[PDB]
Amino acid sequence: EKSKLAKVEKVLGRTGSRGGVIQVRAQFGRFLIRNVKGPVREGDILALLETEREARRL
Amino acid sequence: PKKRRNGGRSKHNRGHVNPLRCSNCGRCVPKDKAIKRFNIRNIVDTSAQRDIKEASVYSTFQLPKLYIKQCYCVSCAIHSRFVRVRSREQRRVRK
Amino acid sequence: DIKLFKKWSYEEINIADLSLVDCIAVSQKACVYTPHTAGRYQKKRFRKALCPIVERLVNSMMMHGRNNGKKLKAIRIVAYAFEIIHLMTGENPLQVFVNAVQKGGPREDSTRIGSAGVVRRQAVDVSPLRRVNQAIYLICTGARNAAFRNIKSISECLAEEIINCANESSSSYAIKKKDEIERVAKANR
């Protein structure tokens, strides 16, 4: 319901069997590794519906 | 044509060696031929690990480890990729 | 003193989301008198975000084979829809459309991820460009399906769909499809 805004500070790589998944590192000011669908850039802004969650390594 | 000098196992100056049973598939294998692995694992992953930390009394808690010591047969071991297939020269490389 | 369709200003419109501010264009180069510009917007990856928002609306409005390339008919449809929108709930129709764009795309989704051979349907996050594109696509599809074998005209259907999308009412196509996407996303992770 209530979004949380996080800033993308770099892009790490692509996962998925067909490579349709993007790994980022986002910052509120804590850091998280999150996992995105769709074209992204460093500088973009995400609307996180969950706060306590990370992505496994790639 | 004798592809291995030691015949696939490390036995010398002995007649018989007692067998053990594969941790995955139950087959009997002599103890000197099975591949051994020793594991020191955690009970949970790191996020649950920290979640237990502030749910705990004593203010200084450390989770215990697990000690396993598993053993496998050739077929059941190289299907899981603990061991792979190498070239003629690379086979001789121990360690 | 440049107006859309020579009637509406968008000199005072705001976004108020701050995630979608960079991805929708009502500013210096994108202030136009008519939504026809024959630009080259697909040559690079992110240049799609500088096409004026109403021209992207009209670009999705000509679909299902029967209507491919018929740009002017789409522009006429959109212009009369904006007149109908202004007549009822009298506001700037472009502001209403921007509000509806901001609401019609899901914020999170699901996909198959191959963590360690065994897989799931894990929840993922949606980027701002993806959200804008999905909002446009779902609004256009809702209006197009409403008007097929119906007494009501296409522009009446489009005006109704945009107004309902801006008000979060669960009688629009986009809002309900988006809610279903988000429910499944919350269920699979």
Added chain:
RNA sequence: AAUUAUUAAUCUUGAACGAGGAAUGCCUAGUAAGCAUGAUUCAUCAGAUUGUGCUGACUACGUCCCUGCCCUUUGUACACA
């Protein structure tokens, strides 16, 4: 030379079809799709090829999951493989 009706013109007659099951094809920019046209055959006949222009999108800027092709190591009792 027109019957088994060459093609064209006028009035009359007015069928199935309401978006297509299991499957499966082509395609990344003036491109897909939609729209018509010149030539080839040609006494007469294009719902076909081969060119030309007109109106003009959506989606990606990737991957090795399916299919195909290639290279390295490995096994072979195959060599018409």
